[PDB]
Amino acid sequence: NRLDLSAYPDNPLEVVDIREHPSTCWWWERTAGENRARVRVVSGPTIPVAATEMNKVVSLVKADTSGRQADQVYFGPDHANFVA
Amino acid sequence: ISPPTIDPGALPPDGPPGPLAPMKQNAYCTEVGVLPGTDFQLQPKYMEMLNLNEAWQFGRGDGVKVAVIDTGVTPHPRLPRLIPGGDYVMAGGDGLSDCDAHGTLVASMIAAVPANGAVPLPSVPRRPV
């Protein structure tokens, strides 16, 4: 045993059609009292926000043109105000 | 107190290392030891922040030369790529001995090689103190 071969998948890829799913997100979550933080990737036809709440997304001003400041913000249920 | 200003014409000329005036040793080199109850089989707590297990995927930094201007370094079988650069405190010194015990911690904390089933080099020609 002298080669890795761990990078390649065991079967051909199920490439998702970007024409159908033009939205993708990186998701991070931690439960209080746990030693590990979970990371997952999501895709879909639209942002993962309820259809009824889609109207109350907040549109930010964008003074910083360097491309490292978001355009929109949404505070769903169980959000947090005081953060470390 | 404004920030520093510089005149590039004043840099000192190059030449072999040596003190400005003759010097002699005044004290005995400091001793070292281990605190009660430590266990070297657990990683140091400071390595958790750096996440080195993931950072090393791109390589271990092969081919980079780091200069340690300090109190010198003492050779050890875990530092297989040490080069003597010179001494400004004592004439005729290689800059390859550590009387203050400070230089070997800084140097070994950067380049010390991990453990292995056999030592890389079994030789030990180390000079006395």
Added chain:
Amino acid sequence: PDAFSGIAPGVEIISIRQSSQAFGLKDPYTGDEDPQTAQKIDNVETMARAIVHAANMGASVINISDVMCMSARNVIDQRALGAAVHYAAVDKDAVIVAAAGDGSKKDCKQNPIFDPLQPDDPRAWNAVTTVVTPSWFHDYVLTVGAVDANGQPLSKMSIAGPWVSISAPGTDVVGLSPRDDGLINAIDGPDNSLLVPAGTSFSAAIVSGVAALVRAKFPELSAYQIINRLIHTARPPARGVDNQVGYGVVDPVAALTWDVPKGPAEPPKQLSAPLVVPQPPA
């Protein structure tokens, strides 16, 4: 059998001995100048020589974990040291890392922080009471402050000057043993007491390792660009910039993979935008 290992096991290190407390002058008379100030001028001159020498040896990263504390009054002329730093930083493209200096040394005193009553200078240069050299040359040298293993700043042990630019851990130090073949954790103090080492001199070592890895992956970047890559990826303090820790805590994986802009930091032109009021109904 042993979990310890260096930050960059592949590097090659050059050792130079430039300072030590075990040696002294064997003609103590020094004339017109006081024996205590006479020693500082000798250290400044000898320090400049060591930096020039290390650069001509071809080193790409220079680590300085021994720094000199000096009063704001009675400051010594740095002319020779200033020119040596410029030569090594620009004409030889070396990256210079220096420790912020510990509060346990002979002459180091705590500096004042930012004052909300005078927004003229966000770093409060005018309030400086003590200088740390060569860390002083913030345009060419990267100064590292210290934080504990949890991330809280060691307010009682590091000098909070305006030159402080980044920080890294500085506790629970471990390393190879001199005069032996094993590991160590403490040193014999003046008394029989077993003293444990800590401070910025070790934090400067961690950053010296990370800098070596980064400019192994991006060999095309110049010294000035490598510093900006480390600064922009650090995790910031509650004020965005603070004399206690500089821009923040170092973050290795980030520096090695994020797409940091190649130009230096620039502020936005203007913050306001027009309000799009709806059209009224007839």
